[PDB]
Design a protein around this ligand. Structure first.
Ligand SMILES: CCCCCCCCCCCCCCCCCC(=O)OC[C@H](COP(=O)([O-])OCC(O)COP(=O)([O-])OC[C@@H](COC(=O)CCCCCCCCCCCCCCCCC)OC(=O)CCCCCCCCCCCCCCCCC)OC(=O)CCCCCCCCCCCCCCCCC
Ligand SMILES: CCCCCCCCCCCCCCCCCC(=O)OC[C@H](COP(=O)([O-])OCC(O)COP(=O)([O-])OC[C@@H](COC(=O)CCCCCCCCCCCCCCCCC)OC(=O)CCCCCCCCCCCCCCCCC)OC(=O)CCCCCCCCCCCCCCCCC
Ligand SMILES: CCCCCCCCCCCCCCCCCC(=O)OC[C@H](COP(=O)([O-])OCC(O)COP(=O)([O-])OC[C@@H](COC(=O)CCCCCCCCCCCCCCCCC)OC(=O)CCCCCCCCCCCCCCCCC)OC(=O)CCCCCCCCCCCCCCCCC
Ligand SMILES: CCCCCCCCCCCCCCCCC[C@@H](O)O[C@H](CO[C@H](O)CCCCCCCCCCCCCCC)COP(=O)(O)OCC[N+](C)(C)C
Ligand SMILES: CCCCCCCCCCCCCCCCC[C@@H](O)O[C@H](CO[C@H](O)CCCCCCCCCCCCCCC)COP(=O)(O)OCC[N+](C)(C)C
Ligand SMILES: CCCCCCCCCCCCCCCCC[C@@H](O)O[C@H](CO[C@H](O)CCCCCCCCCCCCCCC)COP(=O)(O)OCC[N+](C)(C)C
Ligand SMILES: CCCCCCCC/C=C\CCCCCCCC(=O)OC[C@H](COP(=O)(O)OCCN)OC(=O)CCCCCCC/C=C\CCCCCCCC
Ligand SMILES: CCCCCCCC/C=C\CCCCCCCC(=O)O[C@H](COC(=O)CCCCCCC/C=C/CCCCCCCC)COP(=O)(O)OCCN
Lengths: 107, 53, 70, 42, 140, 57, 121, 56, 459, 347
């Protein structure tokens, strides 16, 4: 069996490289310290300072396009009107029956 | 598919041989000249569906 | 301030939606009408569509044919 | 290999592109005018 | 041709069990003979006798499958007193699959055939009820 | 035993993917295994011509 | 809709004369821009295949690609618009000429139409 | 240093230019859906003395 | 809507023109800016919708998903920054291009005023995901995984296309607005039954349903970290969005047809939660947890009540964020240990305390601790199902108990106990990873302050 | 051969196809088919080896039998109506024999057996010409008489072609046989819409022609005819492998690629005529074509296969002969889905 016991010419599997040996204060972003530091800074500034704070403030103070206060005030004025005249609050029929034309069965 | 070059150019490359009733040499008539003439005149411009019906 | 600088009023979206709904409804009716017209034209054949060729009568020779009965 | 920028081919390509663009502009102007004339716009 | 299809379809589903079985057996024999002809044309196994034996085996297998499917489908439809129900065709198809598996002598194949045939027969009955067209004529 | 191995790793795998792979592999082996003899192909073509002449009319 | 046999059709005309009665597509048409983008992509792929700097190998070649694509796209868009206009014209004429096949549906309000109600429970 | 950092940082203008162009394209698409402007039964309104369109 | 789409498209030339060592910085900054821009869509109305044009419209169902899709890209870049260090610049640019194409496809899918355009983009999302899984996966099974992830999907989606065009031949339109305004009841017929199945199964295969969930563990375990995040966070929600959009035309046939799928989901959540208990793989455990949560979302959509829809929307958003965070944590462990087995790396709280805190928070939010939005969605779905039938509460309680059990099991196995003696290559956690977990977790606890932003159009 | 002779033969093939396309007389169509067949054989035998000669003689046998059947159908049609014009077939099974002859010319099932054999025997350029240009004339003739076909027979043959292509492509390692089975499946897709819309047939033909041209010219650029030979291309031209994988994804019918456009349209058209089952079956069968395309893509670009030491020398050389239309073909076969409505141009 003169086979070399090697299936092919393969590079040996490299060992994992640690970013902390060649650069303490490594931030885990890049091997180049300057690119590393600036990547950390841009990530922190645009993620935490810009989006997370300003976007949260923007969402918090969104104008009432869902018309919650409008609906509340409409309901208050309507119930004030109906309590005054004694109408029985909300009617059971959403649409008035006189404008509906039922089909006569005659069965 | 069909590219009607003959109609565009007015060439008559192969239309002379399509039917029996089209200018035979020495005015020799086909055996069914009258029937083919009538059938062609019936269906001219009518279209395949309406001609068939 | 947010509503003034970033957004517009409800009438804009309301009327844009009405226009969009009108366009889409007309398109749907046109599609159905076109399908019906295609079916009728293919079934009957009197329409401009589905017009299969028939022998041109300009090819016929109208002359005496060496025999009186054609 | 060791070749200069073939100025004949460069000139031909530039001239073809410029001619095509000029022809397209002229054809568009003529079509717009013809459409306006047929539909009685201006 | 379509003669066998007409013969099978003309008979009512809940009556004439033997006639339906005969029509199904005829259709099965026809398709088995066609498959045997294709196999012989593509692959000459060893000789004339082996070829005719394979033809007979395939034809009798297909005829048996058709027979079993027809009887079960018709008997189930008659006993259940609910004609035009795909469940009877499923059961008939399932029975047919089981007999194929018994012929080939494999529980898996028999089990597999029962599930698939039951599905195909139910689909065919559903298409007959709803008018599904496999070969649609040009409409528009 | 049941949820992980019996159903998820075996039967749910057996039904949809494995059966499809087996059927497609068998059909591919059947269809593609032709010995390149024009005699068999021509006999099949003749059979098909006869079948179409006897069936589609 | 088989319009190959449509009457009065010149065989090999790409754009008939009546097509000039339709508004031409704008030169800033989005479809024209997409055709130019296709030409630019063709130029980039041409540079890549020949092992040249993809973005800055041949400016004349890429310009020619974009120009030819825009030219053909403009003419193709004209033909497409004409063909659709022909289809619509034929459909409207056929509807007008066959009143018995396209009757006017009676307008019925929802207040007088009984629709079945299916509760969600 | 101008004209040197530009050749390295010119890619940073691409996204904001895309945002501005998208805003312009959105307004351009808005301009083509004015068929029902000031015609809704809910917002039929008489124009102001110096108003031409209710919304742009 | 183009104010979001155009910058996403411009992300590609910027990425390809960037310097060899500035691709990550530029991509991250501009993706964060695009997310900030997309935040404007959250201003919805109680009226119909935000109809921008004939092609794209927004909704309070579409807006949270769009915001999550935009926000996920910077996190994906930050997590992919680690294991792509030894990669050539061209291939890193290609990876970023795949991510950008996926984001653009998802953005155009979620607006999609028309159903055929929705289908086109819904299938267009397949190609970048398949390439990412089968090109930048580590093991030899990735190829097989890709095949599964492809064919399953197509097996459900090709019938849908047929059904879709069929509908446009009868109704005359596929626009969502016209479909909703002109909806008519479906007669109980075999043809209508099969139309229902064709419309439904394409989206039920992507959730996935319990019987059709086999592709998900393979695809999640084999894909790289960015692929796992995009699969678990957004791609699973496409089926829920599709069912929510398409169930309008299926009534009243849904009442009868929903029973098999309701049974499958209600039993499959229990089955997959039990499967999570006996798992030797972290990624497989997280994938099966995703399957259970999406089974609950399927139940919610099938019940078809307003509370069901609100709870389902909230649960999709919450599960997306939580599952992405869990996958990131497991990836941080794997990049140190290179094994991806739960039992091998133990006692990590002693060595990495802050990462243990992140693990605890992620497990707590996966366990549906109130008042997290996970719990809000869970509780809304449970209440709607109880109104549907009072016997569902047994199955839901069982699911909650098993969920708590396996979540705390995963936390305790990896973080607590005694550290493995021979494992000595565990370096301190980087700033990048801690920032990644913080950016995953802070939006959840901010959204619990304003739940109505993620409760859907039925709020 | 002599370049003048090759040019003359190519022009004769094109002239035969054009004569078939422009003529209105059945005899002239037969003459055009005869001219095309006459000029095609030496093109198939440019590179002289026993395999090329065998492929050429098989092709000649099949095409001559098809031509004789076509002439027989013409003669019966003349017998039952004294007509030479190409119109409605005017008769029963005379039309059946015309359909069978055109199917044998196109390679539709069950007359598909010669396509893999001839494609494998001949070179890549001959295969390109055979699978691209040799479909125009029979498809044009079919489109002209498309109102005459029996829909049952045409649909049966189209479904059989799709099934056979899908199943046969699964077992292939040689690239040319894969191309042949892909051609069979695409022809099956093409002929299943002929009874309903010939415009969709022409659109599908154009898309398939563009995709096949891009595929064959990529295979010629990276001169590999086998899966393992193609697996070595990444170590010299990675961009070629990437474009090849994108083209393969397009050929599988994946949206948003170009290959999705025909099937989509066809399916839509087929649902307009109340045909639901057959489009569904067609899609489920096309899944097989997609599977073996995906396997080729796996072996080509998505994974890096082992190489050889001699490949290093190939790194120092560049392709002397370059195909100009390859980038345009790739772009057209990949990125023209948004331009779909342009099919109104009656392409
Ligand atoms: C209770 C009220 C508090 C209000 C004050 C404001 C607090 C703001 C905090 C916001 C959330 C924190 C962010 C999460 C990441 C952690 C940060 C970090 O890295 O720590 C490093 C930092 C420095 O420590 P170190 O020594 O450097 O590191 C050592 C190791 O890390 C070793 O680490 P460790 O062992 O020290 O662990 C850290 C600690 C903290 O780390 C965590 O685990 C935080 C996770 C908490 C909740 C987990 C998810 C469950 C869903 C709840 C969502 C509600 C959010 C409400 C709105 C939030 C706004 C953003 O872990 C815990 O103690 C477990 C907490 C479990 C709480 C369960 C009870 C839930 C309901 C509570 C009430 C909420 C609503 C009340 C409404 C009714 C009354 C008004 O540690 C801290 O700062 C601890 C944070 C303070 C404890 C918070 C616990 C409860 C707060 C809940 C949210 C706020 C409530 C809002 C008003 C309520 C009134
Ligand atoms: C739309 C439907 C289109 C369907 C597909 C179209 C068929 C395309 C193939 C036609 C020609 C075959 C060819 O050029 O090789 C394939 C070619 C690849 O070229 P290649 O593999 O590097 O050349 C190897 C040749 O086999 C090596 O042969 P060679 O170098 O010895 O040939 C000498 C050369 C040079 O010819 C001369 O020397 C000219 C001398 C004049 C002689 C006067 C004779 C008069 C009688 O002549 C030719 O190459 C043939 C040109 C014939 C003129 C056609 C009119 O691929 C294409 O051309 C595809 C083009 C895309 C479709 C056509 C344009 C789009 C519409
Ligand atoms: C959705 C719609 C929106 C997006 C549209 C998407 C499509 C657009 C583009 C279409 C294609 C055109 C260009 C591609 C040509 C290929 C050339 C190339 O490789 O790139 C190298 C080149 C840089 O490398 P280099 O230094 O020149 O030389 C290196 C060699 O080229 C090569 O170096 P090497 O050979 O040493 O490296 C080997 C590498 C090289 O191999 C490759 O890179 C192959 C290239 C990709 C294949 C192209 C397929 C054809 C198009 C299909 C697109 C599919 C989209 C549908 C979604 C499904 C995705 C598959 O191959 C591998 O690593 C093997 C494994 C590959 C992994 C699996 C393959 C997946 C590829 C799929 C990519 C699909 C998207 C491509 C996007 C663009 C990519 C460049 O890239 C570029 O610089 C060109 C990029 C575009 C230029 C932008 C200029 C515009 C900016 C200024 C104007 C501002 C515009 C706005 C105006 C207003 C502002 C004020
Ligand atoms: C480290 C230890 C602690 C130190 C810090 C001590 C201080 C603690 C205080 C912090 C939490 C304690 C609770 C105090 C609550 C006060 C703030 C709260 O009241 O405001 C909320 C406001 O918060 C926002 O509503 C929620 C935040 C927005 C969430 C969006 C996420 C940000 C986008 C980033 C990408 C998103 C990714 C996920 C996709 C969806 C509720 O506002 P609301 O009652 O309503 O009305 C506001 C006023 N109005 C009436 C004028 C409108
Ligand atoms: C693999 C993991 C899960 C995958 C997905 C599974 C979910 C899909 C299951 C589909 C749901 C059921 C399909 C049809 C339901 C209709 C109701 C029917 O079952 O009940 C009776 C129907 O009776 C019988 O069931 C008839 C059908 C019998 C044949 C079907 C096969 C049964 C088992 C097959 C299951 C295999 C599924 C997977 C296929 C690959 C009611 O009797 P009837 O009033 O008359 O019919 C009412 C309907 N009408 C009005 C339209 C006529
Ligand atoms: C696959 C991508 C498309 C590429 C198409 C090729 C591109 C290069 C072609 C260069 C110019 C070709 C145009 C020919 C010039 C004049 C044509 C004219 O004389 O012919 C007319 C016909 O014009 C042409 O047929 C139209 C060609 C346009 C093809 C483009 C359609 C592509 C479909 C959508 C995909 C988007 C592609 C966009 C990028 C190219 C008259 O035809 P007619 O004698 O009356 O009837 C025969 C045809 N019938 C039987 C079907 C009715
Ligand atoms: C009508 C016909 C419908 C056809 C439907 C096609 C479904 C698409 C999958 C086709 C795959 C067929 C090929 C196959 O599986 O072969 C077995 C193949 C052999 O491996 P090779 O790499 O080819 O070679 C190994 C030797 N060196 O095994 C595998 O690797 C398969 C691994 C991936 C399986 C894909 C999962 C597909 C099943 C999911 C559901 C889709 C089914 C479609 C119909 C569903 C019913 C409604
Ligand atoms: C995850 C993998 C699962 C695969 C998905 C399977 C479920 C999808 C259903 C199977 C395909 C059906 C597609 C139907 C397309 C919609 C069109 C439609 O519904 O119209 C019907 C068409 O209905 C049909 O034709 C259905 C025939 C089905 C043929 C193919 C069957 C495929 C296998 C079915 C068995 C499996 C059933 C359950 C599958 C669940 C998933 C496991 C009406 O037809 P017309 O003739 O035009 O109406 C006039 C007469 N009333």
């Amino acid at each position: 069996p003169p086979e070399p016991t090697i299936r092919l010419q393969e590079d040996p599997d490299p060992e994992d490289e640690n970013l902390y040996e060649k650069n303490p204060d490594s931030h885990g972003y890049d091997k180049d310290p300057i690119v590393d530091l600036w990547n950390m800074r841009v990530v922190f500034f645009f993620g935490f300072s810009i989006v997370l704070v300003l976007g949260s403030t923007f969402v918090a103070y969104l104008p009432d396009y869902r018309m919650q206060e409008w609906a509340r005030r409409e309901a208050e004025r309507l119930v004030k009107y109906r309590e005054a005249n004694g109408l029985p609050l909300m009617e059971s029929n959403c649409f008035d029956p006189n404008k509906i034309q039922l089909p006569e069965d005659e069965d | 598919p069909f590219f009607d070059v003959q109609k565009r150019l007015g060439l008559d490359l192969d239309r002379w041989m399509t039917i029996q009733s089209a200018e035979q040499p020495h005015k020799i008539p086909g055996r069914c000249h009258a029937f083919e003439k009538e059938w062609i005149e019936c269906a001219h411009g009518i279209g395949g569906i309406r001609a068939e019906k | 301030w947010i509503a003034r600088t970033f957004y517009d009023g409800p009438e804009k979206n309301y009327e844009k939606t009405m226009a969009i709904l009108q366009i889409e409804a007309e398109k749907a009716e046109l599609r159905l009408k076109e399908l019906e017209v295609r079916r009728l034209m293919r079934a009957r054949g009197d329409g401009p569509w589905y017009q299969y060729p028939t022998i041109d009568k300009a090819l016929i020779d109208h002359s005496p044919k060496t025999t009186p009965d054609n | 290999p060791h070749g200069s920028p073939d100025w004949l081919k460069v000139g031909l390509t530039l001239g073809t592109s410029v001619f095509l663009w000029i022809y397209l502009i002229k054809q568009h102007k003529e079509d717009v005018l013809e459409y306006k004339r047929r539909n009685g716009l201006e | 041709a379509k003669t066998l299809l007409h013969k099978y379809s003309d008979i009512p589903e809940g009556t004439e069990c033997h006639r339906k079985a005969y029509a199904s057996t005829s259709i099965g024999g026809a398709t088995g003979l066609i498959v045997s002809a294709y196999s012989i044309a593509l692959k000459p196994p060893a000789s004339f006798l082996e070829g005719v034996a394979r033809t007979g085996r395939y034809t009798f297998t297909s005829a048996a499958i058709g027979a079993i499917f027809g009887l079960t489908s018709c008997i189930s439809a008659q006993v259940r007193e609910k004609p035009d129900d795909p469940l009877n065709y499923f059961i008939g198809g399932c029975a047919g699959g089981l007999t194929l598996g018994a012929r080939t002598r494999s529980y898996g194949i028999g089990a597999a055939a029962c599930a698939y045939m039951g599905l195909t027969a139910a689909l065919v009955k559903m298409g007959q009820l709803e008018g599904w067209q496999v070969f649609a004529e040009p409409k528009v | 035993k049941s949820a992980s191995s019996l159903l998820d790793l075996i039967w749910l795998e057996t039904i949809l993917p494995k059966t499809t792979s087996f059927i497609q592999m068998k059909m591919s082996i059947m269809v593609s295994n032709q010995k390149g003899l024009i005699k068999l192909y021509f006999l099949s073509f003749l059979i098909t011509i006869m079948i179409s002449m006897t069936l589609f009319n | 809709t088989m319009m190959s046999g449509r009457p009065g059709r010149v065989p090999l005309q790409f754009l008939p004369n009546e097509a000039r009665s339709l508004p031409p597509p704008k030169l800033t048409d989005p479809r024209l821009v997409y055709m130019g983008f296709l030409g630019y992509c063709s130029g980039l792929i041409d540079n890549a295949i020949r092992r040249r700097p993809v973005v800055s190998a041949g400016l004349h070649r890429q310009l020619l690609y974009v120009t030819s694509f825009v030219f053909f796209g403009y003419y193709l868009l004209k033909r497409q618009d004409y063909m659709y206009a022909l289809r619509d014209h034929d459909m409207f004429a056929y509807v007008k000429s066959h009143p018995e096949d396209f009757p006017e549906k009676d307008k019925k309000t929802y207040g007088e139409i009984l629709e079945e109600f299916h509760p969600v429970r | 240093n101008v004209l040197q950092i530009v050749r390295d940082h010119w890619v940073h203008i691409l996204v904001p230019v895309g945002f501005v162009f998208g805003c312009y394209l959105d307004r351009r698409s808005d301009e083509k859906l004015t068929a029902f402007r000031n015609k809704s039964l809910l917002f039929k309104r008489e124009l102001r003395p110096n108003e031409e369109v209710t919304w742009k | 809507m183009l104010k979001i789409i155009i910058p996403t498209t411009m992300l590609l030339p910027m990425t390809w023109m960037s310097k060899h060592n500035m691709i990550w910085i530029n991509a991250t900054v501009h993706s964060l800016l695009i997310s900030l821009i997309s935040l404007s869509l959250l201003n919805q109305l109680g009226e119909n919708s935000l109809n921008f044009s004939l092609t794209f419209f927004s909704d309070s169902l579409s807006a949270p998903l769009l915001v999550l899709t935009t926000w996920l890209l910077p996190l994906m870049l930050m997590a992919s920054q680690s294991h792509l260090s030894k990669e050539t610049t061209t291939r890193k640019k290609l990876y970023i291009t795949m991510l950008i194409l996926l984001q653009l496809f998802l953005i155009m899918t979620f607006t999609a005023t028309e159903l055929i355009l929705f289908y086109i983009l819904f299938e267009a999302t397949l190609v970048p995901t398949l390439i990412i899984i089968t090109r930048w996966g580590n093991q030899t099974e990735r190829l097989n995984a890709g095949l599964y992830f492809l064919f399953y999907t197509l097996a459900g989606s090709l019938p849908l296309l047929v059904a879709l065009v069929y509908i446009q031949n009868t109704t005359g339109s596929l626009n969502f607005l016209i479909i909703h305004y002109w909806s008519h009841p479906l007669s109980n017929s075999w043809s209508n039954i099969f139309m229902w199945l064709a419309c439904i199964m394409a989206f039920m295969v992507k959730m996935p349903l319990y019987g059709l969930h086999l592709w998900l563990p393979k695809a999640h375990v084999e894909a790289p970290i960015a692929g796992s995040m995009v699969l678990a966070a957004v791609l699973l929600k496409l089926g829920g969005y599709g069912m929510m959009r398409i169930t309008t035309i299926l009534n009243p046939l849904t009442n009868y047809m929903a029973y098999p799928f309701l049974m499958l989901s209600m039993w499959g959540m229990i089955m997959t939660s039990s499967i999570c208990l006996r798992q030797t793989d972290l990624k497989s455990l997280i994938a099966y947890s995703s399957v259970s949560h999406m089974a609950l979302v399927i139940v919610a959509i099938m019940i078809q009540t307003p509370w069901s829809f609100m709870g389902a929307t909230a649960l999709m958003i919450a599960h997306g964020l939580t599952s992405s965070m869990l996958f990131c944590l497991a990836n941080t462990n794997y990049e140190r240990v290179h094994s991806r087995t739960m039992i091998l790396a133990r006692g990590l709280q002693t060595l990495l305390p802050l990462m243990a805190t992140w693990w605890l928070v992620a497990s707590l939010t996966n366990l549906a601790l109130p008042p997290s939005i996970n719990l809000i969605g869970e509780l809304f779905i449970i209440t709607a199902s109880f109104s549907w039938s009072n016997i569902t509460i047994i199955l839901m309680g069982m699911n909650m108990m098993i969920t708590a059990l396996y979540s705390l099991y995963m936390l305790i196995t990896t973080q607590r106990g005694k550290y493995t003696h021979h494992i000595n290559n565990i370096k301190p956690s980087f700033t990048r990873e801690n920032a990644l977990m913080a950016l995953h977790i802070l939006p959840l606890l901010l959204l619990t302050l304003n739940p109505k932003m993620i409760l859907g159009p039925l709020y | 051969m002599n370049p003048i002779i090759y040019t003359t033969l190519i022009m004769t093939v094109m002239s035969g196809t054009m004569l078939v396309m422009i003529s209105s007389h059945w005899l002239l169509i037969w003459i055009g088919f005869e001219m095309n067949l006459l000029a095609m054989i030496p093109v198939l035998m440019k590179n002289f080896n026993p395999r090329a000669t065998e492929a050429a003689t098989k092709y000649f046998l099949t095409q001559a039998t098809a031509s004789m059947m076509l002439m027989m159908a013409i003669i019966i049609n003349l017998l039952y109506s004294g007509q030479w014009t190409i119109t409605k077939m005017f008769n029963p099974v005379a039309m059946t024999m015309m359909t069978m002859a055109l199917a044998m010319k196109l390679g539709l099932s069950p007359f598909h057996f010669w396509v893999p054999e001839v494609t494998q025997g001949i070179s890549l350029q001959a295969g390109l010409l055979l699978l691209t240009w040799q479909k125009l004339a029979p498809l044009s003739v079919l489109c002209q008489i498309s109102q005459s076909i029996n829909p049952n027979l045409m649909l049966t043959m189209a479904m059989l072609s799709i099934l056979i292509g899908g199943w046969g492509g699964l077992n292939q390692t040689q690239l040319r046989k894969i191309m042949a089975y892909s051609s069979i499946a695409h022809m099956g897709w093409m002929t299943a819409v002929l009874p309903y819309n010939t415009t969709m047939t022409i659109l599908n033909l154009l898309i398939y022609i563009t995709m096949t041209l891009a595929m064959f010219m990529l295979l010629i650029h990276s001169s590999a005819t086998t899966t393992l030979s193609l697996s070595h291309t990444w170590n010299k031209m990675p961009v070629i492998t990437s474009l090849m994988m994108v083209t393969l994804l397009s050929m599988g019918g994946l949206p948003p690629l170009s290959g999705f456009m025909p099937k989509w349209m066809i399916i839509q058209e087929m649902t307009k005529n109340e045909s639901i089952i057959m489009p569904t079956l067609m899609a489920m069968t096309a899944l097989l074509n997609l599977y073996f395309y995906m396997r080729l893509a796996y072996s080509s670009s998505l994974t890096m296969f082992p190489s050889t030491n001699n490949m290093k020398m190939k790194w120092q050389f560049e392709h002397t002969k370059q195909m100009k239309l390859l980038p345009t073909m790739i772009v057209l076969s990949t990125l023209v889905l948004p331009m779909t409505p342009a099919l109104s141009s009656l392409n």
